[PDB]
Design a protein around this ligand. Structure first.
Ligand SMILES: [Cl-]
Length: 120
């Protein structure tokens, strides 16, 4: 099946559901993440940690500083304009994550549509 992809409106719905089995994987650099991010997302920088989603759990936490996401969850990948999100999705899907998705529009899309002004 085609990788599941989400529009802004789809993402707004997903954020508002607070689904415990969904992980929002923002692969921008930490400096980009600090400017603005979706609440409750995680930051797993692609540029500085391109192999992150290939690491075992112990090494993931040493390198990234947060726990390795549970592979049973749906991981939704994005960056700023989408390229890095797409690359990171490929790493994860090739390393044991069977439920992965894209937010192609990424944080540029989120901010363009005013997502940063939501409180969902
Ligand atoms: Cl998790």
């Amino acid at each position: 099946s085609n990788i599941q992809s989400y529009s802004f409106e789809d993402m707004k719905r997903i954020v508002g559901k607070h689904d415990p089995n969904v992980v929002l994987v923002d692969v921008r650099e930490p400096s980009e993440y600090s400017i603005v991010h979706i609440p409750a997302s995680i930051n797993v920088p692609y540029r500085s940690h391109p192999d992150a989603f290939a690491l075992d759990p112990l090494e993931f936490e040493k390198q990234i500083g947060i726990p390795k996401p549970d592979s049973a969850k749906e991981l939704i990948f994005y960056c700023a304009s989408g390229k890095r999100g797409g690359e990171a999705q490929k790493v994860a899907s090739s390393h044991g994550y069977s439920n992965t998705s894209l937010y192609p529009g990424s944080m540029n899309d989120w901010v363009s549509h005013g997502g940063d002004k939501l409180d969902l």
